[PDB]
Amino acid sequence: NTFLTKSVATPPISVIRTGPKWWADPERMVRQKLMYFTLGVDQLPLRRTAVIQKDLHRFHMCKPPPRIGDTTGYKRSRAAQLTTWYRRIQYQEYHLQHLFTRHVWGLVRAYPGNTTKIQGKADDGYVGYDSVPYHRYNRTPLPFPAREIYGRRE
């Protein structure tokens, strides 16, 4: 794991909105599915999201379905509940992927990026070789060299 400097915190909604660019990054959906097929877990969530985004990509170059001029307006919050179920599906999936990687990194004994919490080894985030001698979120002075996380037998 090379990238160990600081990272930018983006919410799931915008991490998903990047659509088929990185959210439905097919080669990233695949490479996280490989973590699941290694660990021996069912890929129910990532496969659900892949189905949804395959639909969305197939029906991105197309126009929405026509609205009717209803003062009573039902289509609106119905398509709203539809979208926000898709969104909640993807929020769950986002969390599953993050959890599996931050656990598999404690299993491979590999260090995560800076202040990337891994509850497999340390209840707080991994701070080490940082652009600041203070904790980026706790404001705790860093040890030199980077703090050590796993055992020493490799």
Binding site: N1, F3, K6, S7, V8, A9, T10, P11, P12, I13, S14, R31, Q32, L34, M35, T38, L39, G40, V41, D42, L44, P45, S77, R78, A80, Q81, T83, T84, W85, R87, R88, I89, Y91, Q92, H95, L96, H98, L99, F100, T101, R102, H103, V104, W105, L107, V108, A110, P112, G113, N114, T115, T116, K117, I118, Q119, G120, D123, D124, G125, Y137
Partner: protein, 161 residues
């Protein structure tokens, strides 16, 4: 040489006052930001930092898997499978009228930063501790995964009559 022990005019010049704050215009203070992560809520901090898994890590994991699998070990396996059965149950259909609130318009300019700031500062507070839209707990039944670490096939000397 023979560095003079008194300085005439160069050292007397007006002191350029150091930049007070940091960041843009060197004015952005030292106080918490939208970006701060939380270690008290979930195994994945919220908001999380972006991680990136590589094929190096996929192979290291595959090799770790061969070793922990041929050492008779299945305990970290059943830990994996339980931490999977925690968060991978289908979350309920949202109640009709439940929607992520967009930032209300007609306060800031269209290109402002407070629009996305409120979005990030609410998506932070909506932690996994606040995920009430998915089934989690001892109140959930799982008709799709296996109930006890005894139904896993590595302990397959248990179901035999």
């Amino acid at each position: 040489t023979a560095t003079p022990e008194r300085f005439s005019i160069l050292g007397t010049t007006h002191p350029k006052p150091k930049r007070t704050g940091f960041g843009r215009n060197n004015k952005m203070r030292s106080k918490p930001s939208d970006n701060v992560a939380w270690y008290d809520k979930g195994p994945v901090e919220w908001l999380p930092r972006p991680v990136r898994l590589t094929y190096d890590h996929l192979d290291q994991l595959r090799d770790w898997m061969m070793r922990e699998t041929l050492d008779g070990k299945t305990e970290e396996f059943n830990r994996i499978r339980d931490m999977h059965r925690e968060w991978s149950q289908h979350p309920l259909m949202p109640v009709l009228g439940d929607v992520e609130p967009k930032f209300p318009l007609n306060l800031f300019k269209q290109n402002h930063r407070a629009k996305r700031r409120f979005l990030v500062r609410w998506h932070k507070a909506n932690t996994p501790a606040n995920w009430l839209w998915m089934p989690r707990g001892p109140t959930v039944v799982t008709p799709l995964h296996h109930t006890n670490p005894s139904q896993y096939p590595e302990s397959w000397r248990q179901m035999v009559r």
